[PDB]
Write a protein that binds this DNA or RNA. Sequence first.
RNA 1: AAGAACCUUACCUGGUCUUGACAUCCACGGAAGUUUUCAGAGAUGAGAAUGUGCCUUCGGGAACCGUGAGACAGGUGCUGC
RNA 2: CCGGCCGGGAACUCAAAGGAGACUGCCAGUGAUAAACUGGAGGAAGGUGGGGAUGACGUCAAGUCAUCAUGGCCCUUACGACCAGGGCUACACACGUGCUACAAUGGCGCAUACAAAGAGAAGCGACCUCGCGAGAGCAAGCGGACCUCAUAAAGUGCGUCGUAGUCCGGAUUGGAGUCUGCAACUCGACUCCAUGAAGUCGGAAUCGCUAGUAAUCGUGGAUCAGAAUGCCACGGUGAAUAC
Lengths: 100, 206, 86, 151, 98, 127, 114
Amino acid sequence: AKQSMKAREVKRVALADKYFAKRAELKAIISDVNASDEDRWNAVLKLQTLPRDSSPSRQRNRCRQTGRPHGFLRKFGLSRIKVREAAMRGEIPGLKKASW
Amino acid sequence: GQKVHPNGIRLGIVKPWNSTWFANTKEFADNLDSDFKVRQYLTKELAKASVSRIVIERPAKSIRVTIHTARPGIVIGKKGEDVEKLRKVVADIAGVPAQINIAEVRKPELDAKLVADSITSQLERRVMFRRAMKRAVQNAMRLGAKGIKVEVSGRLGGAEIARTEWYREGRVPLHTLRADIDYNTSEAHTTYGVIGVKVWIFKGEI
Amino acid sequence: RSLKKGPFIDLHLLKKVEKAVESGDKKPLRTWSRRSTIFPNMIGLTIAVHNGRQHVPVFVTDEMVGHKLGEFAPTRTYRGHAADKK
Amino acid sequence: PRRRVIGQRKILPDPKFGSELLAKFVNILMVDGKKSTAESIVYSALETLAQRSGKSELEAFEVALENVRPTVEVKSRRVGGSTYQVPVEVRPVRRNALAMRWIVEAARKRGDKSMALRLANELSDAAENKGTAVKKREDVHRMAEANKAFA
Amino acid sequence: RIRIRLKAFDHRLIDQATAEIVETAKRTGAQVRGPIPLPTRKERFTVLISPHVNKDARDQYEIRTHLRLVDIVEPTEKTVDALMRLDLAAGVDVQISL
Amino acid sequence: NQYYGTGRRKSSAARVFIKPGNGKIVINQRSLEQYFGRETARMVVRQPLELVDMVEKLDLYITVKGGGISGQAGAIRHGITRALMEYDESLRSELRKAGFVTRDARQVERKKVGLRKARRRPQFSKR
Amino acid sequence: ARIAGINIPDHKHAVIALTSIYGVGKTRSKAILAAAGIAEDVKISELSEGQIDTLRDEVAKFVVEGDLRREISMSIKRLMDLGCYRGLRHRRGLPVRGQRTKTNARTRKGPRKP
RNA sequence: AAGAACCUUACCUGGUCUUGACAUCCACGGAAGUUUUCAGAGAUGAGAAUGUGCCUUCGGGAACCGUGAGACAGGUGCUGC
RNA sequence: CCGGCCGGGAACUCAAAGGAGACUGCCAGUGAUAAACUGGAGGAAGGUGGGGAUGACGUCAAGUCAUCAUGGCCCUUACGACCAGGGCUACACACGUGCUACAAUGGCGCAUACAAAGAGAAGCGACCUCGCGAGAGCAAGCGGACCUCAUAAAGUGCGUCGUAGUCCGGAUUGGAGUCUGCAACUCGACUCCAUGAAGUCGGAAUCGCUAGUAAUCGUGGAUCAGAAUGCCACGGUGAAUAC
Ligand SMILES: [Mg+2]
Ligand SMILES: [Mg+2]
Ligand SMILES: [Mg+2]
Ligand SMILES: [Mg+2]
């Protein structure tokens, strides 16, 4: 599904985890109730200084096969149809045709 | 365009999974896509080598990959140097440390994948599909496969409209879950566009 | 109604408006940020906000501060509608 | 049912007494799958009409609904292009059930302060043959009788 | 004292696993507290069967992860030595806990 | 010096102990009348024992879990009827003549796909 | 009874009484009546004139009715004139909070004349 | 569509790029990496410090980055008749 | 410290493995004497016990080239690529599928019961403290039959409201906030206060359901930073009728 844009996505995951999760405290510590010093405001300003793609929220969490946005399952990582496909051909352990 | 995948419905009973290993929420996805990439690498690289199916398993952060193939000589190669090189690559993809087993299918003219890839080779070399699939069926009946259904769809020899043919011999009881039936399908990329071919073989009742 | 702590402006707009104030009013500003918030010092400025097709000049008055830039640059065009009586 | 005949169901007896037809009456009351509130309505209504009828409790209820309990009912068969109605003799099992259904509807249509009060007073006047329930029975009865010829 | 808690997908496989570990503790100087079935977790999935519309057609999937608890009481040194490296039976995940 | 039975109905499982001696009945350390005994289906729980002599002869210490009011009630019911193990063959015919021995399996039906409540569908329109 | 702008219904309990004045709902009327000590179940007819004389100043403490209606009008007027988006919609008779204008939201749009 | 604020996004306006964001091949160099300045809506563009790391053919390597040449790459573009 | 809390016990719930058990097996009647049918007993279950998966050959040139794969065909200093803003959320209207109602078998207030299933480590997040509340601070426990989400709601008792556009209804708007997120203007959810519209059971027409079903009550999950009145799933109460 347009490897242009799933290339965009591998880029944005790279950048995103290269900045936040570590330097994310710029909000995570400063922006909480504590010292109410102006320096904190300076901090949020430093939070717009950064590239927008840095934030994780921007991940659309695509398929790891076709890069398909919708129908994704984060337990497996594949869109619903390749879940079905691999499921029936036997590539995913434990999955069974369900009747309870 | 309705019938369920005959492996999938049957997989609980007589068909073990092609992947046997355990994982939790964390690593399930990553070793599953790594699984994908190792499988595509092998089946693409060995496409000529006639591999029947690939069953992989991951005991204790090590991966053991059993290759089921008709022509083991070429995948092992002279003095087994090639199996070593393959093992290096799949160590790279699957994560360290790779292992590999070569298992030989004693009668390749039975199992669905090998008959399928055969007649998709005949079919991509523009033999008449008719006696491609005839040749397949009579071949599987010679060994005494208790049943077979070979079906071919697609353009069929440049005919502008698609059409479907199939030949059923002996028992092929799809609704008997217990019944052991091998199934696969392989596409042929032909000058007129893809033409797919499915094969059901019925090896035994229990 | 949003942002419990800290009114929000994007730094490039607060700096452009800072050095715009200290230099005296001259020309409208070309900002694309609908996302920012009017501040007390911004009043009297004719700064043009992006409506998606072009920039519309809006003259900032102190009566509008707590609001944001966007809603004073209406994006969707409506017109009379089809209706245009029988 | 194209053919198969089914055995009906033993319905659990009312808690206070042993009358199954009363518990059935409860079932025709309840909406919203609520047995306990509508069953409370059954009781409250029954005892608040009891002493005023002068009979003790249940036999006032049978002597009550007996008057709204139809005898012949009219359905439509063998249409001649004008779709005429035929009278037929109603089952003994359907006559009291149909009765109870009619009375419950009667209570709901006109309205009053509470259903127990409403049910009770309308039933009390059903024992007299004032009620719209008994009137409903008679109009049904007239319609059956006016078309007896067809059988 | 120490409890190895083992979980798998197919129980067919898990049986002889817990069995050969319980008896490999038996012949290593027993005093084992026995296997317990505990509950098995059902992961459940409904995926839409077609590549494009007809939402009404869905497909069900289970993942039944079966677990067992063994909880051996007295850890003789040879027992704890025999319960490591002999855990075998590929496809199950056995968790040592002390 | 004790006798037992189980019984269960709709997701609620019962356990019932009957013994000779007094005639009092208790559910979860609390009296029957103040457990569920103030809500309709008053009769259902004591009626199997009413089918024969009730008097002061038999004590019931019973406990249950799961289900709602009536589910529990029936659970207990089936509980006694299979807890009358003493004289069971002699009271067996009476019980089956009047029922109670049947479990009455009859539990909720699964919601299916595309239909909202197990049998109901989303008002089909024809065009 | 006759406190604030109006308040003159009958057969009503105390909070239900005070909800008739514009700008006092159930909870803040309950605040009033818990503030001036009046019991809840008492209809205003049978309460003595003393604690209603307290009721008048107690409800006077909160801004109600007259000035409310005006301040509302002048807020809808402040947007309406200002040029704010929600003003624009107040002005055009559509919804403001962002509701669907496709199909519903004809409570403000009014029942169709065509 | 199992979940359009940005993303998603495939559409529109405007600012930009042309072997290209994405893959292999060649030539010519640099380690990668890290921090920081200005201009700008941001893309980007001009910079400045820092780092210089694992074979030993040492003329060569591994990975990543950078410029040019084409062979190509790319298209959620049309046709489910 | 009256909570299985601690010794203690493996009996029973419960869990999940392996088995038993129901097939016209037995009795009688009917039936071509056959297949089978009817009724009985035993039995937890009776003739397909209930439910699900499983969809023959083919039809609609049905759907999908926008998951993917693919032949042709077209664009190649642009139909390719990156970015900000806008837009998919517009609105005089018409339809479809739902939620909430129009009330007293009810609303509102206090008290009081009784579930199943499921999720969880960039997570669930208790106790305690602050705030009316959405929530905030602190921090334990838990890859979980242990810890958390988690007070089930209808129900039951008592008190009130008294047929009124009402103490029904909660749409609309104003003010003040909170949470997520670089960012809630276009265009989030939730809270508090105020405001309290249409609606008195619905025309022609039309739909689902044969029992734990309909109806009604809540609970969980996927997707997901946030964003369910949708979808999938679980249990509670629980009918009428089939001549
Ligand atoms: Mg592509
Ligand atoms: Mg997202
Ligand atoms: Mg299907
Ligand atoms: Mg639907």
